[PDB]
Amino acid sequence: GRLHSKGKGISASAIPYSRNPPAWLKTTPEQVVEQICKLARKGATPSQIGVILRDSHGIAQVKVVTGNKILRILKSNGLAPDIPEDLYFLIKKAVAVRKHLERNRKDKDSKFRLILIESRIHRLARYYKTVGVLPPTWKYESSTASTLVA
Amino acid sequence: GGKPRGLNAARKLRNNRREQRWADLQYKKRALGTAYKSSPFGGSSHAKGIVLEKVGVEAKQPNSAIRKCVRVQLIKNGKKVTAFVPNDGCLNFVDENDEVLLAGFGRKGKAKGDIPGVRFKVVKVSGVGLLALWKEKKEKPR
Amino acid sequence: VRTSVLHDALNSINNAEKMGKRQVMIRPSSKVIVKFLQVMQRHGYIGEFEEVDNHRSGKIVVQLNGRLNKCGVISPRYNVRLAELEKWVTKLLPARQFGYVILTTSAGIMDHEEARRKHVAGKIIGFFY
RNA sequence: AUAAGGGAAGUCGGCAAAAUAGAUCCGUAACUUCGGGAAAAGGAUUGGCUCUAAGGGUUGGGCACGUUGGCGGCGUGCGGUUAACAACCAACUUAGAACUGGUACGGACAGGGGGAAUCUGACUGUCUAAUUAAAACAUAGCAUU
RNA sequence: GCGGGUAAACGGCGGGAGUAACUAUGACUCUCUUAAGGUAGCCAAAUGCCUCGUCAUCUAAUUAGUGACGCGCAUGAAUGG
RNA sequence: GUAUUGGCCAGCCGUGGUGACAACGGGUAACGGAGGGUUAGGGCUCGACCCCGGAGAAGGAGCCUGAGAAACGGCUACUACA
RNA sequence: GGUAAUUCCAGCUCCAAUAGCGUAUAUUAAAGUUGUUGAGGUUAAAAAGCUCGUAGUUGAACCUUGGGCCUAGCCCGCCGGUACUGGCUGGGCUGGGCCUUUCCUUCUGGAGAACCGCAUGCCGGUGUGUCGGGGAACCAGGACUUUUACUCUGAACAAAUUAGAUCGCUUAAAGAAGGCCUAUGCUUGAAUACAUUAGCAUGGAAUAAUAGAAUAGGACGUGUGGUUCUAUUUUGUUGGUUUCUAGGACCGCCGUAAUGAUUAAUAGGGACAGUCGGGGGCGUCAGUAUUCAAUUGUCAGAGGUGAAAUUCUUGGAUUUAUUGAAGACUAACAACUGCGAAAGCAUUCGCCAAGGAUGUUUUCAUUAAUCAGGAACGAAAGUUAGGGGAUCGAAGACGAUCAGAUACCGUCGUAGUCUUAACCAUAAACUAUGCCGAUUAGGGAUCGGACGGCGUUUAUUUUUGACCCGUUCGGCACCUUACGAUAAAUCAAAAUGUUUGGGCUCCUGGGGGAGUAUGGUCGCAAGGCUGAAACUUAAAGAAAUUG
RNA sequence: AAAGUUAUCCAAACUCGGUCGUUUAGAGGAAGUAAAAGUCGUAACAAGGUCUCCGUAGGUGAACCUGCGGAGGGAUCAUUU
């Protein structure tokens, strides 16, 4: 029911039964791409760009109007990041707790909690390599993990 | 309940059976071969021995009697055991130094009835057999 | 997690028959279940079944006509010879004169008493009577 | 200083003497305060002569299309990285092979005998100059006023 | 002088009668005596007279050596075990 | 070198080979198989022994004759018996 | 069996098998007490203290179905006739051909039928003939095709043994013989099936895996340059040379095309938004109470028990008031209420990192479940060095009770109880109930989030807060009932199990000996982990009923 | 062309050490099981007369006591502003 917990949740998002853009939008696909690229240039990430595009003006679901996904669009325009978002975000958590442990040496629970993050990181990295997204020698040395972040 | 059931999982089923097989008592005594090493009889059915003395054995609680046992030393190994004469008034047919033949009680190691701790019984004496003397169909050699 | 949708569907059907209802829902759709339902339907053990549709796995709804008993499934896909079928029909069937074991062959998902006629064999999936 | 055969049978007691001994290569137990025991125990080689191999330094390349200077030095601008070359200079240490001898070769000097246990002091150290160097004294550790 | 404290202060740490289904001994009991009556450990030991104690091992032969036994003339806990 | 291939052997040169899918080692009152005993189906257990294959002639090694032997109702030496 | 023996020793009578019966040891069925089919794990023997994770096992849905014609072989129903014969436009089952976007690779050679035109001939046709033109069945030869698992059919594979056909050795176990008339003779059998794993061919294409075009390094062309190599037989013969020509490798321009990417799982991960919690760490704030100390005031016994007694007192006990110090702990609110993987966690504020549920027309796209060895945390007691040492309090000393009392009752009191830096890794670590997933019955309470609604309440008010009614998601629990389960007690799981198979890990096999001995390994030690045998025994044990 | 003889090779057999495996002798020590009539107490089963049991630590002729932290398999499913 959940990877690393004892509880189950079903707070998902239901996708409508309509593969046609609402008529009132009346927006062409050609103009859609530039604003997406605009936010990526200012420094945003594919996940968060969608919520502004959805909230601020018009398109609820990019796929129907465009025919392709945000990452697919970005990859063909050479703005795709080197390391996939899911792997990147996890690392950001692991580094911060490490800094906490060196000052607070008696925080036993976080030591247990820390075990979870890289175990998730290791499990996710294995899949990326066997499909061909990551080079087959990437290893995530716990020492230099900071360099990977930036 | 709790077995492995997959199609490519014959190895686990074989391993568990061979391991859990040892908790059985009947099978385990055969594999280790304790009877051959330990039992006074080296896996055989009968044996011959020489008589040392005659002893009386007291019965257990509900009964009360003297069970009239005998002391024997085997020729194969030279160990000494106790044997139950199994008839009525036969202690007048066995004397000292008479080279008797022994069998078991048919309980496969444990003691039968009330006699506290004897696992064998005399079948022959001077090669004549007990029942022959009892029904006076023969005579002992002189 | 879900590992045998065919077993899940059959289990739901059995509950209704022993409780006496006339309707069951089936959440995951697949060719194997839908063809499995047809083999009973050609013998009358079930009634009319409706397939809904959405861009997803897809639900199914059939209404139970009664006159149906235990219908199970064998989870480990065994290998059956054409000679070792009398063993299986002796194994799990109330009687010889009726009941059906269902196989999968290269000629399609089908049952015995015709596999004997067509001289075919394959793997076992279930049974119903 | 040396002695045939025996090898502690001598004597309170192996007292005195003999035996092992350098270097290179193998192998090394119980026990333990895991640092030791350990050169444990126990084995093999060692000359002469003729050869072979390995372990370095210094100086040039280094080009072209001009330049100031008495063939050459600097101040240029470029390129180019010899599957690395050529000349000269200098001691020793290590390894391998053949031949050879009355089978000998750390040829003199120099140069540990070893093992299984018991009593007693933890260890390095100190004292009766001129009969006793020890189990005696001292020591770090512990405790008391 | 009378009354309390103090043993890693000096030192000390016993005798006598009955008894369990052969016997034998005495867990247990009764009794005298003072401040308490040798606990954990160890042994013919550099500490044991009787003594060349008794048993095993080492030798052809051992008052010597080692391992056990313990009513120990007269072992024993910082006079440290 | 053998009747012939082969790390079978002699020289020079590389650093490899097997393993939790159980290597290496230890036990077997263990010659292997065709097969015997008992049964709903699935099995459990035995197999020195009349047929096929392997090894041995007290224990080890060495050899002559011949197409074929490391032979033993053939020889040589040691061990243990006699 | 203890003086009338249903059981000993004897006579009579009777029972079972019978030329055989008894006894001992080994093995099989009985044994669903080894359990893949097919066995237990709340209390009877047994779910590791809890979580992470590698070998190993198992893994959501989705890509050619349907319809329209023709034909064959076989069974049943029907009619009728003589076991035999024909018929139904009979009903079916198996198979083979075409059409619907689907048909089914290709080259060379062989012989040759049906359909076609000729005439010698007969009754709209045929042998005619070295007459000739098509596309197709077979054979031979060559080239091309995702790979394993699975199933069908073939080949090959001792004799004896197993099942099994035939023959009156006088029958049978056996044997492979024999049979007919009259015969100088004739005639037969010595069959058949299986083994089943591995290897060799063939048909099938569901089921379970695996690869293909995404920075196009993609497919095709008798379009068209190019640069490289190989070289038949023909020009009398040989050698060398060349043009054309045949083939192969690499690489450009142009043309052809619907030019190449599955859903977004009541699978999983991550991002985002407002909340939520006695989850954790570091610092910091506050609170009485206990003990001691100082100041202050008086006058006799005070403490303690079922009742006594130790101990303390005019150097004033006990009691009263103000002030100070030390250490531990956060009462009442506090509950069938919360959080955490468990052990556990309750005073304020500040800092630091973390988490579930909810909301969501954001994002990736199978990335998942459980885990032998392996690893992190792990109450209390205990160990090694410091600090601190208020209160309680192992060991111990005294006072009582008691025949004794090394205890239960009382006064003190050392280690310890607290903390810092390191060890130990066991508990009735209990829900005596492993983890993931699906279905199954009614109800009212309760915690967190969201949604809808008439009202009330008091707010620089109105939105909101708070109270009421209802719906929904996720938790800690409870009440009635059994359609179900169990031996029962009881259970919404301990159900969906003789009508037995969703996936994965661990543990037990009558009671003792025994969590002992020996070996290995971790630890300063106490000890932890792994873990037998000899021997002994007919009962130990669970739930419920009557006394 | 025999005896003999020089240098390699295959090698039985013997001596000494090391390691592994099997059988077995022993002064003495510490146990467990059975046969019970003995002897000393009464720990457990009732609120067994101090509720029982678990982990740990110390002590005591013996069953056993006490301290700290747990459990009910208890002698309580339950007490109101």
Word description of this protein:
- The structure is cut from a larger assembly and holds chains A (150 residues), B (142 residues) and C (129 residues).
- In chain A, helix 5 packs antiparallel against helix 6.
- Chain A contains seven helices and no strands.
- Chain A starts with 31 loop residues before the first helix and ends with a helix.
- By secondary structure, chain A is mostly helical.
- Chain B is an alpha+beta fold and 142 residues long.
- Chain B contains four helices and five strands, in the order αααβββββα.
- Chain C is of the alpha+beta class and 129 residues long.
- The longest helix of chain C has 15 residues.
- Chains B and C meet through loops of B and loops of C.
- Chain A binds five RNA strands through helix 2, helix 3, helix 4, helix 5 and helix 6.
Keywords:
part of a larger assembly, 3 chains, B: 142 residues, alpha+beta, 4 helices, 5 strands, 20% helix, 22% strand, elongated, C: 129 residues, four-stranded antiparallel sheet, globular, uS15_NS1_RNA-bd_sf (chain A), Ribosomal_uS15_arc_euk (chain A), small ribosomal subunit rRNA binding (chain A), ribonucleoprotein (chain A)
Give me the side-by-side strand order of the main sheet of chain B: 1-2-3-5-4
Could you give a short account of the major beta sheet of chain B? Answer: 5 strands, mixed, barrel
What is the number of strand segments of chain A?
Answer: 0
Instruction: Find the count of extended strands of chain B (DSSP E, 2+ residues).
Output: 5
Q: Report strand % of chain B.
A: 15-25%
In N-to-C order, the SSE pattern of chain A is: HHHHHHH
Domain Small ribosomal subunit protein uS15 N-terminal (chain A): 1-59
GO molecular function (chain A): small ribosomal subunit rRNA binding; structural constituent of ribosome
Keywords (chain A): Ribonucleoprotein, Ribosomal protein
Protein name (chain A): 40S ribosomal protein S13-like protein
